[PDB]
Symmetry: D2
Amino acid sequence: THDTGLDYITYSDYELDPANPLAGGAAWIEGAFVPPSEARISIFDQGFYTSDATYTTFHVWNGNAFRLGDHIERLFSNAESIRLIPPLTQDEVKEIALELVAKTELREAMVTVTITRGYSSTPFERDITKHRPQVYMSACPYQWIVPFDRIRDGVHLMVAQSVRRTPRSSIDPQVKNFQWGDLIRAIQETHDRGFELPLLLDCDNLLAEGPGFNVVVIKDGVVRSPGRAALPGITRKTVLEIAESLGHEAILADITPAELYDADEVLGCSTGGGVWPFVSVDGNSISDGVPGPVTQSIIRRYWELNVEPSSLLTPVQY
Amino acid sequence: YTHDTGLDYITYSDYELDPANPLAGGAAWIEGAFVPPSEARISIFDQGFYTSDATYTTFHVWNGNAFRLGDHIERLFSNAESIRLIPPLTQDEVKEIALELVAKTELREAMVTVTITRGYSSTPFERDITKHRPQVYMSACPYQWIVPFDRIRDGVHLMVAQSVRRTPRSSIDPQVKNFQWGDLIRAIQETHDRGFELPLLLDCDNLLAEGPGFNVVVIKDGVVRSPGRAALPGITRKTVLEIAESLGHEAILADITPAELYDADEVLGCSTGGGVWPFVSVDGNSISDGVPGPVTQSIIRRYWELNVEPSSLLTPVQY
Amino acid sequence: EIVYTHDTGLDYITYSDYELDPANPLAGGAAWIEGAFVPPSEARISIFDQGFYTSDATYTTFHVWNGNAFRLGDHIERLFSNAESIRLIPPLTQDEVKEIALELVAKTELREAMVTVTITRGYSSTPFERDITKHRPQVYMSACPYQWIVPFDRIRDGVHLMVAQSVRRTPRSSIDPQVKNFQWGDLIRAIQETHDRGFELPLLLDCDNLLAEGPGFNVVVIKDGVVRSPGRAALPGITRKTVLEIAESLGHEAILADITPAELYDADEVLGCSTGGGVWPFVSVDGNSISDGVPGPVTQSIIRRYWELNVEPSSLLTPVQY
Amino acid sequence: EIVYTHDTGLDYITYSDYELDPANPLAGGAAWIEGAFVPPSEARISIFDQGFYTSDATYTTFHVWNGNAFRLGDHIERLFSNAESIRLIPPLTQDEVKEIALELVAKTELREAMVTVTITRGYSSTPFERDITKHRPQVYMSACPYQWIVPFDRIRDGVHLMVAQSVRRTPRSSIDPQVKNFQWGDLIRAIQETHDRGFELPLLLDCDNLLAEGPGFNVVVIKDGVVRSPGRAALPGITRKTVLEIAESLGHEAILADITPAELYDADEVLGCSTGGGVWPFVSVDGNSISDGVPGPVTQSIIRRYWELNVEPSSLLTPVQY
Ligand SMILES: *[C@@H](CC(=O)c1ccc(Br)cc1)c1c(COP(=O)([O-])[O-])cnc(C)c1O
Ligand SMILES: *[C@@H](CC(=O)c1ccc(Br)cc1)c1c(COP(=O)([O-])[O-])cnc(C)c1O
Ligand SMILES: *[C@@H](CC(=O)c1ccc(Br)cc1)c1c(COP(=O)([O-])[O-])cnc(C)c1O
Ligand SMILES: *[C@H](CC(=O)c1ccc(Br)cc1)c1c(COP(=O)([O-])[O-])cnc(C)c1O
């Protein structure tokens, strides 16, 4: 829990049971519910040594899971893209994940579901029937990519020059993955040059995405986000739906660096922190330099959707 | 842990594993402890897993001797430096621990992996770089063969991948050994679809790159060439080019076109995982007369001699 | 002997019935160069024009059918936009270009024609010029008989497509395909590969292995009643624009998108489009049949409607004053 | 009026002392087009030549200094090799090309000159021609006064380099930089960026973010006595070849290699080279000084030796018969 300093983001008023060994954090590994200190996987799992895996991360707020159906549908689609047959159904995954959160007692949480090729085979296996895929889960306190004061005041963005986003013809960014070699290089560049977060470009020098977040660009009342070298984010989807509710045209598109610098407003979005403003790029102010009014309406409406009763929410049974 | 090979130049050791030893035939070193394979586990909160923020190397032991251990650990530490990772052990400390690990398994023929990660005490968004706490993990297992023995003798059928290309140096550098195999796995899958044995990937410029776990070498008019850019600087590759120079051939790193691959006199593959083997066809097209060439055969034999003949390439394991 | 008409064997494509005046030295073909209307044999440019030796130029090609120019306004707007993208200031206005081009066609007496308008950086300057004010851009035009990228029997029966493997479309970060240009090094390589492998036309892929375009044409892919065409590594074609408008009028969702090779092979229908020939079907890819290997019904209705739009009085048509 | 000599301010570069005959209509500049020797104002080509509208062509540019052609054999060999790479069969032999080119220079009376030889696919066919035998390739030549990519004072004092960020060199998988070509879309963008950011010349990177080349020149990087130049995304320059030979003669290791931006910034010395100006220093990159910001000693000895090779009797020189 925290006091946020923002009227639209609150936190539950509760205390964790110290008699419960899973309280405040836990994992599900090979059929067992375990505490964080016992949450370990085999070094012989291909999910480690060939990163042969995909995943998704959903969140729980005030005791409700946000867009669980969308999340598990994306996970299973991503698994299909890499020819991975999950050993559980979508319904089974949902039930186990919700149970895991319940055992932690966490009302505000992050829940990761990972599917790997497993430890019963190697990448050179001739017989595809010999592969034995694994599912791993973890539930932890909600994590913030940017702090609360920066959600209010905005963040300073940098366009990376020493690295570009991996092409779809090598390792597809539309498949959520742990292969962050390029994304880590971008973070390191950000430390060197003295900025807060990086945005990468693609092979054609068009806007891609950042480490753990999508970017959105607002110009003359039109709301645009990168369609190609970017994860199809659930937060992004929500942002574009909100934009349409407010009477704006909202579309996926190819966006140039010139268009980024010349934008009315710019924002970032992710399951890990929700929505926040980007007020400058490479030290150049975006319209002056303070969070724009369309961005502010979007941020407020997003957090309303986390609490107002709808089909977007699934109650956790504690 | 042993085989009859059917080849005069590859011979396993004649011995038996002690069944009273719980580490016999396989073991790992994890967070200061020597453990059996079933207890060899790492934290899911290690960044080496969830951001693949790690590098590694794999060396081998043959007839009780580690092969080119110094070169291997030098490459590992160089790769760590390339990704700004400060190892928590020295090169000497790593060598001593790795050799002890093998000794405890009693394996005379083995594969030994040394991995360095960013660790589990921090996250990718950490503001203070001093807060990172890197980890070292090791494992020792029986020697593994990327191709079987009959195929080392008779040759392998290669495929040039069309649905995927090797990750560029401007995204994830192939010259840093890494676990980020998304492209390499796609290539293996394409090989199953099209009915071939192993794949070779191309780079962004449609020049020869490398394969999943191996380098490629191309021989034409007595000149021996291997890809210099989109390829790991292999220790086996290095040995192959040294052997070629010994035999009086010009041996160089270079940019190689697909046309040059199809028109080659000889083609071979190399890796710590299996040594050296011939590639006798590409996309169903024969390389020369479709049988292993004579320069390839001399290289294969000489490689295995170097694994047994007493030299500075060898380091004895104290069993 | 200039060929300027044909019997097509198709009820929806009909040439005009007329004769060229042999007393006219510009009849059947002509050019506009440095203020002068000239015959083809005198249609020459300076080797010192940067439009040649650095290919520092852009262009467009429109057509005339049964005495009417098709979508002239859209064509000249795209040309001027393409010029702006490469920082080239045209020495004529859009209106002036339209007037000169229409006159040129009139002088040829051609009722069915292809008209190319080219803008170059010129011959008064070099690429290393320090003072940008010293550049003196040039406009060149030519008008010729209508040309067909594919023959009439293939418009009816369909064409055999090949996906290129030895070459890829130049990236937007080097030479932008969204700017019409003469820099065809990649496209010519693709054509040569089609001769090697024994196919009729090539389709190139982009850096991400997504569908791009072909030499002188855009590609369109139809699946479960949805009509899609490549948005990135492709010229914003005027024929493409017309095809998508027609699809919407038939009640289909019609969009620009990123399209995979798997999707191409698994398509219900595939077609090609260009000013140079209109619209035609692609019935196989790499020797694999698309559906049952015959032109699909959505494609057929698009082809027929396209040619109807070339004759039915609309704002898409501009009459030539012969 | 025609400028054909200068006082250079440099002891190692000296023009010839002579006067052009004003009775000669080809004096000071001329071209060879379709079998005819013509003056610059009549030097024109057909707009229907594919060398224009599909840039389906390759070329080379050699120079003449103090009445001798420099490395003519190497130049014509590269030209014929480049033609072969794009499946273009030249309509003249290498000997015929040499003889015609030398005659052309002789007719201009120029002792210091630039000579361009171009081979195109021609005007007797189109890119869609089914029968390869129907292609009729053309050769075009021009001879002009020697041209300087950088002025004399900058050869002495050095040039300010910029690494381009808005554009990258066309990949070998689209349009090959190892085939000399007129397809300069990326190179022109780089020049434009140089005007925007306030620098003198640009250097482009390749797809892997490694050093490529510049517009009309190769780059060379010197570090701890080792001399290196980009091997992949770069023309195999004749000037580059000469520079590396000179480096070996001075006792330096001289090699083609993959070079990173970090290595460029950290270099002891950096230089540029081309037929169009010879050799010159690069003293800063993106406003950052290379070493102490003045031309390095290895660079200076290379520059001087290059110009010695242009005058000292050797097999590198072919005399023009005036
Ligand atoms: C390393 C691949 C291996 O080390 C390995 C080990 C066991 C097996 Br069954 C398969 C592969 C590798 C190389 C080889 O370089 P070196 O000879 O080990 O120094 C080459 N290229 C890639 C991409 C690799 O991963
Ligand atoms: C334009 C190509 C042509 O206009 C053309 C003209 C005549 C012939 Br015989 C062949 C080609 C082009 C397009 C499509 O242009 P639009 O649909 O007519 O506006 C698409 N892609 C490329 C690369 C082109 O050059
Ligand atoms: C060749 C460029 C030239 O030939 C040239 C001639 C005159 C002028 Br003012 C400018 C340029 C070129 C090279 C260098 O090749 P070489 O050393 O002359 O054999 C390198 N890279 C490119 C892209 C070129 O065009
Ligand atoms: C995944 C982002 C996360 O799941 C995540 C988890 C914890 C933290 Br502290 C930060 C981020 C991801 C996204 C997110 O899109 P979505 O809105 O969660 O669907 C976007 N882009 C990339 C590359 C990601 O990895």
